[PDB]
UniProtKB/Swiss-Prot annotation:
<comment type="similarity">
    <text>Belongs to the dynein heavy chain family.</text>
</comment>
<protein>
    <recommendedName>
        <fullName>Cytoplasmic dynein 1 heavy chain 1</fullName>
    </recommendedName>
</protein>
<comment type="subunit">
    <text>Homodimer. The cytoplasmic dynein 1 complex consists of two catalytic heavy chains (HCs) and a number of non-catalytic subunits presented by intermediate chains (ICs), light intermediate chains (LICs) and light chains (LCs); the composition seems to vary in respect to the IC, LIC and LC composition. The heavy chain homodimer serves as a scaffold for the probable homodimeric assembly of the respective non-catalytic subunits. The ICs and LICs bind directly to the HC dimer and dynein LCs assemble on the IC dimer. Interacts with DYNC1LI1; DYNC1LI1 and DYNC1LI2 bind mutually exclusive to DYNC1H1.</text>
</comment>
<comment type="function">
    <text>Cytoplasmic dynein 1 acts as a motor for the intracellular retrograde motility of vesicles and organelles along microtubules. Dynein has ATPase activity; the force-producing power stroke is thought to occur on release of ADP. Plays a role in mitotic spindle assembly and metaphase plate congression.</text>
</comment>
Amino acid sequence: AWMRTLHTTASNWLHLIPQTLSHLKRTVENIKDPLFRFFEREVKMGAKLLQDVRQDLADVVQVCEGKKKQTNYLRTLINELVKGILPRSWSHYTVPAGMTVIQWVSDFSERIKQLQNISLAAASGGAKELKNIHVCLGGLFVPEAYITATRQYVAQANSWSLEELCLEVNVTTSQGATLDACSFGVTGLKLQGATCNNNKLSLSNAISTALPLTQLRWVKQTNTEKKASVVTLPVYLNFTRADLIFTVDFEIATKEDPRSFYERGVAVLCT
């Protein structure tokens, strides 16, 4: 009855979840690269999580087939899966409050697909592709680590100090990908409350406007006074706002004012 349905949905998840993450992040010549280090640690963590999840869910399928004896940990896991609450063991990256296991496995599958793409790019061209690829920001396990890694990579180029770097963002369209050796194309960010019109904000009644390929560039900070036409939008990851990844300074329209943006609740969201 119920247990066969659990077996069927678990088998569907195994079919949906990609197979073992190719831990091909191995280049002693690329160790000094900060981007390579960050991507290597992320791929290692993702591969270990994939192995644990795949093994546990295959064990669940096979105990559904009835040819094994479950233990206390397996009882806890099945009691977690029956009610749809996320397994506590599988939680190693930050979690929006209360999302179902189906939502979690879909998100984890997306993260494994992008990690597969990252590993293939690294095995094809190394650090260069590790920079040119347009990694999405939402699926990354520790996005702030990615921002720090990009800052370090830009610092190594031209041998600039880490603190001499300030982030500037420009939003593109149609996937221009006109990188200037410091831009970091990133996708998936969703602007809640406004729209971007040639990098100029404007309040819109419709919420959650998708931002395609918001280029991340680090430049010398001139310590000049920011004009009144800029706003500091908090960048969160979940739909709930409980994790500040970084901050973005956007130019607003001539008619608009920062007070209205602060009041309306505008904030960039990765998911």
